Design a protein around this ligand. Structure first.
Ligand SMILES: CSc1ccc2scnc2c1NC(=O)N1CCC[C@H](C(N)=O)C1
Ligand SMILES: [Zn+2]
Length: 139
């Protein structure tokens, strides 16, 4: 679990969005596993606007942060789950690092700010949904 709170927006994994997220919907994209809902309170986070390919992510299944080198956002095949049929997920970045399903929502940060959130993983891999292209989150 986990979310990004920036301005009057809450960014979550689409497959973990709550009834309240859907009732306050701003934007969602199944191909990215992202949903953004509106909030009444002002957020705590800021978004990176950069091309970093290294950073640090929070891994809830270890209660620890780990450094990672990750690929540029791209279209990657993701096998079927209870949440989605087998499909290509867009704007996904992969890295070598521990993850388990409950780790979705952990933040990836570089020195500039929030880069994205854990969205996929397995076998010593962890995948992050990028948010750096969503310029409207702070504009
Ligand atoms: C951190 S998630 C994770 C991690 C390890 C393992 S081992 C086996 N399944 C996983 C796993 N789950 C995972 O990749 N998906 C289930 C939730 C929706 C995801 C998506 N964006 O389509 C795909
Ligand atoms: Zn950066």
């Amino acid at each position: 679990s986990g979310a990004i709170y920036v301005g009057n927006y809450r960014v979550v994994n689409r497959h973990l969005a709550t009834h309240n997220d859907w009732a306050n919907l701003v934007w969602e994209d199944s191909s990215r596993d992202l949903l953004v809902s509106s909030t009444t309170a002002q957020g705590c986070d800021t978004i990176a606007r950069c091309d970093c390919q290294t950073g640090v992510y929070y891994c809830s299944s270890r209660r620890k942060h780990y450094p990672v080198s990750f690929s540029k956002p791209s279209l990657i095949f993701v096998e079927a789950s209870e949440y989605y049929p087998a499909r290509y997920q867009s704007h996904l970045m992969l890295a070598v690092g521990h993850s388990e399903p409950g780790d979705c929502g952990g933040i990836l940060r570089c020195q500039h700010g929030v880069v994205g959130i854990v969205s996929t993983g397995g076998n010593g891999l962890v995948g992050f949904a990028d948010v750096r292209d969503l310029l409207w989150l702070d504009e």
